[PDB]
Design an enzyme around this catalytic site. Structure first.
Site, PDB file in Angstrom:
ATOM      1  CG  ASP A  19      -0.142  -0.531   2.602  1.00 50.65           C
ATOM      2  OD1 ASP A  19       1.063  -0.545   2.561  1.00 50.65           O
ATOM      3  OD2 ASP A  19      -0.922  -0.264   3.628  1.00 50.65           O
TER       4      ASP A  19
HETATM    5  C1  LIG Z   1       6.417  12.923  16.718  1.00 50.02           C
HETATM    6  C2  LIG Z   1       5.179  13.642  17.362  1.00 50.02           C
HETATM    7  C3  LIG Z   1       3.992  13.643  16.105  1.00 50.02           C
HETATM    8  C4  LIG Z   1       3.157  12.467  16.024  1.00 50.02           C
HETATM    9  C5  LIG Z   1       2.204  12.848  14.961  1.00 50.02           C
HETATM   10  C6  LIG Z   1       1.544  11.405  14.455  1.00 50.02           C
HETATM   11  C7  LIG Z   1       0.345  10.914  15.401  1.00 50.02           C
HETATM   12  C8  LIG Z   1      -1.015  11.032  14.393  1.00 50.02           C
HETATM   13  C9  LIG Z   1      -1.270   9.506  14.171  1.00 50.02           C
HETATM   14  C10 LIG Z   1      -2.805   9.157  13.981  1.00 50.02           C
HETATM   15  C11 LIG Z   1      -3.192   9.953  12.716  1.00 50.02           C
HETATM   16  C12 LIG Z   1      -4.228   9.110  11.496  1.00 50.02           C
HETATM   17  O1  LIG Z   1      -4.094   7.721  11.649  1.00 50.02           O
HETATM   18  S1  LIG Z   1      -5.395  10.003  10.703  1.00 50.02           S
HETATM   19  C13 LIG Z   1      -6.268   8.631   9.788  1.00 50.02           C
HETATM   20  C14 LIG Z   1      -7.059   9.483   8.376  1.00 50.02           C
HETATM   21  N1  LIG Z   1      -8.009   8.501   8.144  1.00 50.02           N
HETATM   22  C15 LIG Z   1      -8.059   8.109   6.792  1.00 50.02           C
HETATM   23  O2  LIG Z   1      -7.134   8.035   6.177  1.00 50.02           O
HETATM   24  C16 LIG Z   1      -9.079   7.133   6.170  1.00 50.02           C
HETATM   25  C17 LIG Z   1      -9.342   6.901   4.579  1.00 50.02           C
HETATM   26  N2  LIG Z   1      -8.160   6.091   4.086  1.00 50.02           N
HETATM   27  C18 LIG Z   1      -7.149   6.611   3.226  1.00 50.02           C
HETATM   28  O3  LIG Z   1      -7.144   7.687   2.770  1.00 50.02           O
HETATM   29  C19 LIG Z   1      -5.981   5.808   2.695  1.00 50.02           C
HETATM   30  O4  LIG Z   1      -6.243   4.411   2.878  1.00 50.02           O
HETATM   31  C20 LIG Z   1      -4.361   6.126   3.667  1.00 50.02           C
HETATM   32  C21 LIG Z   1      -4.999   5.662   5.116  1.00 50.02           C
HETATM   33  C22 LIG Z   1      -4.111   7.362   3.168  1.00 50.02           C
HETATM   34  C23 LIG Z   1      -3.471   4.906   3.112  1.00 50.02           C
HETATM   35  O5  LIG Z   1      -3.303   5.216   1.743  1.00 50.02           O
HETATM   36  P1  LIG Z   1      -2.791   3.909   0.697  1.00 50.02           P
HETATM   37  O6  LIG Z   1      -3.190   2.747   1.341  1.00 50.02           O
HETATM   38  O7  LIG Z   1      -3.246   4.278  -0.477  1.00 50.02           O
HETATM   39  O8  LIG Z   1      -1.265   3.956   0.657  1.00 50.02           O
END
Ligand SMILES: CCCCCCCCCCCC(=O)SCCNC(=O)CCNC(=O)[C@H](O)C(C)(C)COP(=O)(O)O
Ligand SMILES: CCCCCCCCCCCCCCCCCC(=O)OC[C@H](COP(=O)([O-])OCC(O)COP(=O)([O-])OC[C@@H](COC(=O)CCCCCCCCCCCCCCCCC)OC(=O)CCCCCCCCCCCCCCCCC)OC(=O)CCCCCCCCCCCCCCCCC
Ligand SMILES: CCCCCCCCCCCCCCCCC[C@@H](O)O[C@H](CO[C@H](O)CCCCCCCCCCCCCCC)COP(=O)(O)OCC[N+](C)(C)C
Ligand SMILES: CCCCCCCCCCCCCCCCC[C@@H](O)O[C@H](CO[C@H](O)CCCCCCCCCCCCCCC)COP(=O)(O)OCC[N+](C)(C)C
Lengths: 175, 178, 88, 56, 53, 68, 459
Positions: free
Chosen positions: C43
């Site tokens: 991915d």
């Molecule tokens: C160092 C101190 C800073 C720490 C910052 C980090 C902490 C934040 C961690 C949590 C934030 C999140 O997860 S925010 C989660 C956001 N929600 C979504 O993205 C749902 C829809 N899915 C998609 O868009 C794609 O599947 C995708 C996920 C892009 C994958 O891309 P590919 O599969 O096509 O490669």
């Protein structure tokens, strides 16, 4: 050397201590001065001897220019331009000579401070006193005349100072 | 730097960029390799927990909290590669990059040395001169009537054509010129 | 002197070496022209990790807009060669 | 052959000739300001047995 | 021109002034007179106004 | 391996520097040699008193031969 | 001193009788010879001036200015022959005639013994300068600039004329020597105040004083390169020379009439130094630099002390040379790229290394690096101002910082960074331009070697 008069630029009798070795190791400074002497001071002396031999075969002389004394600005009529001109030039020459006198005294003071080492605060009081007297006289003579100075302005300053001193003396006699 | 930008970044692109930035700053915090691998795996799990959200509004809201958390917990002095736009050698060699057209002003005595190089230079200049009329015509043909809408350029399609506007890309000075 | 004059074969060897240390790809199944999403079933997060590994290995950063496009090891090698002025 | 050389480069004597003419005119101006020659109180001097004027 | 300027004769009378100052310093130090006087003009030739009141 | 290093034309700056050095030296080496020869073989005048009845010329009031 | 005046009047017909392709060579050679001749005026006395005749005299203040003028004429000739190549022969001869007439008027101005003659020549200098600016300037602003150059001068100088004749009906003479010897104090009355203003305002507007300086940016920007050279290096020093001359009859009114002008000079020096920090035009930056330096010179003249006069003389000489060099350096880039914007041609050190060295030396001299004569003049003026009042060391100090900033700013903007990509018409520097830079810069350090030649009569 005999280049400069030793009365105008005086110096102490220059007492230096004798070498009193106490260590059996050789003094590297002694060998360094011997090497420097034999390697530098002798060829320079030979070159200077040649230069002075060449100079001795061509001896010509230059003279110090003498200036007479002309009437001062006090002996000049109000609009007599010629006498004013001569007196003004004489005043400028005297001003330059006074500047050089102060220069000589300051050179004396600086040489004393460097020479006396760590005792300069006590061993150079006489030079400081001479500089104080000379500086006071020079400041009374020429200070605050400003640019566009002339003999007339200096005379006006002296007359003002004389008037102030006379008034002070006459009021003090009244006490 | 080589690719033409788009009008906007997609949600997936923003998420990927935030993931890379968070990983790099966490590595800046965790100096040692094993500790970094541990916390990078933790961050990867944290990221892929909400990977399957069908609600776009909630996804962008989660991204908003992610950006806020990153900005609060960022490293004040992150590691920068020496030649990156913040590194210690970013533009160190730009003073040694001299444009090629300067060679056109060399004295004939200077050109007396390196004869074969200047012969090859003449060949390249002739190729560019021949190529220019075609490059302009191709750009004229392939352009929509309302002006270009992106900064991308077309390739060469004809038998002996050259990609339009190629001279200053091909004749870059160097990365370590002198 | 300084670092030796990096060549295309060396770059390809290093990229394949880094990729063959990844636990999510099979070393036998991996080839120079294998696609990351299609042939290898990764991915976008895995692609970002691969780009970061390449950055660590060669010691220079790849911008995100350019890194989004590299999909096969040959593309990564080509990008590195064009970046570092390698022609042999 | 010097005809062409002269008619081409005769403009090179105008400035030196002007310099000499200016020196001569400066001397002519100097000769009209001798009302105090050997008459200043600072430089008044007895003439040598041969010389006629202290300065020209 | 730089050689000509460097060797211009001393018409500013700097060396002459230094020698004159040396003479005067020697004389005034030998005979005990002060090195300088606050008055640059002899008061005998200055006539102050009679009345100051 | 050796590559071509692209530089701007260094011929003209070098030529100007060479020409300036040539002209400055052309007129200044004779001047330095003449000054050294005059200094060595015709020293400076020695300070002396004006003899009685003598009126020196103005240039006699200076000490360096070139200044005189 | 006709040995200098006559050869210029001979430069006139030699230029008008020259063959069509030999005007520049003859003019430059004979102008250099005239400069060599004028070098003899540096042999000054310690008491009075060189009174050549009833009309002309030379002093320790005017001799360096005369040398600078006669040295500047050939430099203008070399700097002008590039952009006048396509001109006809008659117009080239007319341009050279304007330059020669300007030099003649300046030479006669700096040596006049009479104040009305000084006024006549110091006003005659306008016509050749105005003709040059409005005829051989490049853009359409030049016409307006000429007007701004003209009336700003005349509105300041016409009252002076009146004052001058008034003085001659009171004292009977305007000869400078008689004026100096027969000087009398100025009383404190309204008539004396307005006489002071009439005597001062012309030279204060020619400096120019802050608030009265608006003509200078126009005149120095729309003029040709020779016009800018002569306007910045010599024509600004007419005000300083005239003030140093005329102040002998204004005491003790100056003691309190200098306050508004001192305040204007200091605050406007700060203001113009700050203006130099945000300038998109490279020529305007040099013009405002000239304004700041001349404000310093105004302060030095106004406080009326020997150290201030020495520093002022040194500063005028150093500023003339430095500003002429800076204008020529900017004109080289302008002739290359046909634009005056500073951020247009960047990174020129890569393309022109020796020109970059010339730029570095000019900028280092502009910020008064020791032991350059710029620093000597600035430090003498600052010491005199400190004696005048201890608080001045604030404002002066402020200026010392700001100058350096903008100076290096110009360098860092024009020589460092990366070259502009689309500019490909930057040819190697010609021998003529390098020789121009060298002949500007070598006299500066040569005078640094012997600084008493430019320190004026108060030395
Ligand atoms: C160092 C101190 C800073 C720490 C910052 C980090 C902490 C934040 C961690 C949590 C934030 C999140 O997860 S925010 C989660 C956001 N929600 C979504 O993205 C749902 C829809 N899915 C998609 O868009 C794609 O599947 C995708 C996920 C892009 C994958 O891309 P590919 O599969 O096509 O490669
Ligand atoms: C103390 C040192 C003593 C040295 C002894 C020899 C001195 C020779 C001086 C020659 C005359 C000056 C020439 C200036 C124009 C440049 C000519 C040129 O194009 O050369 C190209 C030539 C060939 O190079 P290139 O390959 O063409 O390179 C071109 C590229 O652009 C690449 O160019 P670049 O990157 O090489 O740039 C040139 C280089 C050098 O170029 C320059 O910057 C020249 C101008 C220097 C700054 C001047 C303004 C500051 C005021 C100083 C006034 C001093 C005047 C003294 C009398 C000088 C009379 C001419 O740049 C620098 O090195 C830095 C410049 C800033 C120096 C700051 C110094 C602060 C003051 C130091 C003390 C000064 C007073 C000394 C006395 C103190 C008490 C004892 O190179 C040289 O010939 C050498 C360069 C000159 C370096 C001299 C710097 C030190 C000398 C200071 C003044 C002289 C003092 C001598 C008496 C002893 C004191
Ligand atoms: C390209 C690479 C260059 C770098 C390599 C260069 C190699 C070395 C050359 C550099 C020389 C270093 C300088 C060291 C100083 C030595 C020279 C010095 O000693 O001479 C001075 C002399 O300097 C001159 O006086 C200054 C020159 C005059 C400047 C006039 C410039 C020419 C006129 C052009 C027009 C002027 C326009 C500006 C208007 C004013 C001494 O002054 P002074 O204490 O007295 O002498 C006492 C003894 N005397 C009197 C018997 C002679
Ligand atoms: C844009 C920049 C251009 C250059 C600016 C040039 C600056 C010129 C300013 C002139 C300096 C001073 C002028 C007059 C000297 C004193 C000024 C006055 O304020 O002082 C008091 C004057 O008192 C009152 O102020 C009366 C004057 C009031 C009327 C003057 C008009 C001021 C308005 C300001 C307008 C701006 C002028 C500039 C226009 C461009 C002193 O009291 P007094 O003792 O009695 O007068 C002394 C003269 N005595 C001895 C003969 C009696």
């Amino acid at each position: 050397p005999d280049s400069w008069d030793k009365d105008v630029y005086p110096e102490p009798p220059r007492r230096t201590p004798a070498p009193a070795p106490q260590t059996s190791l050789p003094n590297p400074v002694t060998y360094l001065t011997k090497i420097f002497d034999l390697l530098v001071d002798r060829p320079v002396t030979l070159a200077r001897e040649f230069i002075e031999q060449q100079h001795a075969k061509n001896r010509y002389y230059y003279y110090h220019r003498e200036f007479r004394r002309v009437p001062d600005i006090t002996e000049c009529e109000e609009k007599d331009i010629l006498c004013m001109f001569e007196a003004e030039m004489q005043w400028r020459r005297d001003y330059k000579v006074d500047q050089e006198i102060v220069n000589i005294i300051q050179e004396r003071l600086k040489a004393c401070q460097q020479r006396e080492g760590e005792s300069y605060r006590q061993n150079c009081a006489k030079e400081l006193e001479q500089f104080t007297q000379v500086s006071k006289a020079f400041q009374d003579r020429y200070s605050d005349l400003g640019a566009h100075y002339s003999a007339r302005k200096c005379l006006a300053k002296q007359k003002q100072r004389m008037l102030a001193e006379r008034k002070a003396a006459k009021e003090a006699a009244a006490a | 730097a080589f690719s033409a930008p788009a009008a906007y970044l997609t949600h997936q692109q923003k998420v990927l960029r935030l993931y890379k930035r968070a990983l790099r700053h966490l590595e800046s915090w965790c100096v040692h390799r094993d500790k970094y691998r541990y916390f990078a795996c933790l961050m990867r799990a944290r990221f892929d927990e909400h990977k399957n959200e069908k609600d776009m509004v909630k996804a962008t809201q989660l991204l908003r909290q992610a950006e806020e958390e990153f900005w609060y917990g960022q490293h004040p002095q992150p590691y920068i590669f020496p030649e990156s736009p913040g590194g210690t050698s970013y533009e160190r060699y730009e003073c040694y990059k001299v444009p090629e057209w300067c060679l056109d002003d060399w004295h004939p005595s200077e050109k007396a040395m390196y004869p074969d190089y200047f012969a090859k230079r003449e060949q390249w200049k002739r190729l560019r001169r021949e190529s220019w009329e075609r490059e302009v015509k191709q750009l004229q043909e392939e352009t929509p009537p309302g002006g270009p809408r992106t900064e991308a350029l077309p390739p060469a399609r004809k038998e002996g054509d050259l990609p339009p506007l190629w001279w200053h890309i091909v004749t870059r000075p160097r990365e370590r010129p002198m | 002197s300084d670092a030796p004059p990096l060549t295309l074969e060396a770059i390809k060897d290093r990229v394949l070496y880094v990729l063959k240390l990844y636990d999510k790809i099979d070393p036998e199944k991996l080839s120079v022209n294998s696609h990351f999403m299609k042939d290898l079933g990764l991915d976008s997060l895995d692609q970002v990790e691969i780009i970061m590994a390449m950055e660590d290995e060669f010691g220079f950063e790849i911008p995100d807009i350019d890194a989004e496009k590299l999909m096969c090891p040959q593309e990564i090698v080509d990008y590195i060669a064009d970046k570092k002025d390698v022609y042999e | 052959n010097v005809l062409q050389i002269v008619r081409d480069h005769w403009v090179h004597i105008l400035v030196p000739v002007g310099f000499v003419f200016g020196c001569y005119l400066d001397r002519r101006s100097d000769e009209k300001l001798t009302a105090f020659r050997n008459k200043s109180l600072l430089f008044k001097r007895e003439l040598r047995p041969n010389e006629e004027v202290t300065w020209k | 021109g730089s050689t000509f300027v460097a060797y211009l004769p001393d018409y500013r009378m700097q060396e002459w002034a230094r020698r004159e100052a040396e003479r005067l310093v020697k004389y005034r130090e030998a005979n005990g007179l002060p090195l300088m006087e606050s008055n640059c003009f002899d008061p005998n030739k200055i006539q102050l106004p009679e009345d100051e009141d | 391996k050796r590559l071509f290093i692209i530089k701007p034309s260094g011929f003209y700056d070098r030529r100007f520097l060479k020409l300036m050095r040539f002209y400055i030296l052309l007129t200044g080496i004779p001047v330095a040699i003449g000054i050294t020869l005059v200094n060595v073989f015709i020293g400076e005048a020695e300070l002396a008193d004006i003899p009685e009845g003598y009126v020196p010329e103005h240039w006699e009031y200076f000490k360096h031969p070139i200044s005189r | 001193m006709l040995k200098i005046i006559i050869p210029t009047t001979m430069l006139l017909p030699m230029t008008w009788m020259s063959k069509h392709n030999m005007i520049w060579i003859n003019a430059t050679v004979h102008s250099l010879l005239i400069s060599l001749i004028s070098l003899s005026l540096l042999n000054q006395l310690g008491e009075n001036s060189l009174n050549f005749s009833l009309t002309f005299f030379s002093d320790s203040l005017s001799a360096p200015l005369l040398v600078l003028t006669t040295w500047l004429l050939p430099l203008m000739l070399m700097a002008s022959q590039s952009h006048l190549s396509k001109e006809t022969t008659t117009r080239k001869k007319l341009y050279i005639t304007m330059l020669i007439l300007l030099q003649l008027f300046l030479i006669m101005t700096f040596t006049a013994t009479e104040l009305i003659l000084f006024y006549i020549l110091f006003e005659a200098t306008l016509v050749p300068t105005l003709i040059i600016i409005t005829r051989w300037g490049n853009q359409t602003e030049r016409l307006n600039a000429g007007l701004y150059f003209l009336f700003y001068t005349l509105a300041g100088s016409l009252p002076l004329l009146v004052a001058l004749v008034y003085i001659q009906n009171t004292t009977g003479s305007l000869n400078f020597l008689i004026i100096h010897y027969w000087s009398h104090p100025l009383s404190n009355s309204w008539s004396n105040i307005f006489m002071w203003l009439a005597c001062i305002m012309a030279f204060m507007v020619k400096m120019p004083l802050y608030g009265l300086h608006l003509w200078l940016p126009k005149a120095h920007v729309e003029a040709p390169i020779a016009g800018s050279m002569v306007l910045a290096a010599v024509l600004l020093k007419l005000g300083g020379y005239g003030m140093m001359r005329i102040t002998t009859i204004l005491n003790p009114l100056t003691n309190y009439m200098a306050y508004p002008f001192l305040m204007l000079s200091m605050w406007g020096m700060i203001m113009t130094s700050s203006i130099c920090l945000r300038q998109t035009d490279l020529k305007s930056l040099i013009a405002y630099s000239s304004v700041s330096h001349m404000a310093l010179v105004i302060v030095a003249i106004m406080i009326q002390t020997p150290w201030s006069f020495m520093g002022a003389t040194a500063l005028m000489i150093a500023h003339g040379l430095t500003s002429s060099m800076l204008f020529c350096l900017a004109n080289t880039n302008y002739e290359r790229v046909h634009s005056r914007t500073m951020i247009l041609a960047r990174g020129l050190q890569t393309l022109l290394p020796l020109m970059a060295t010339w730029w570095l030396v000019a900028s280092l001299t502009n910020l008064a690096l020791p032991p350059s004569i710029n620093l000597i003049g600035e430090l003498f003026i600052i010491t005199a101002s400190f004696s005048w009042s201890n608080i001045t060391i604030i404002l002066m100090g402020m200026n010392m910082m700001i100058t350096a900033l903008y100076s290096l700013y110009m360098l860092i903007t024009t020589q460092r960074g990366k070259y502009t990509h689309h500019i490909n018409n930057i040819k190697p520097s010609f021998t003529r331009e390098n020789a121009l830079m060298a002949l500007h810069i070598l006299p500066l350090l040569l005078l640094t070697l012997n600084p008493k030649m430019i320190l004026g009569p108060l030395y």
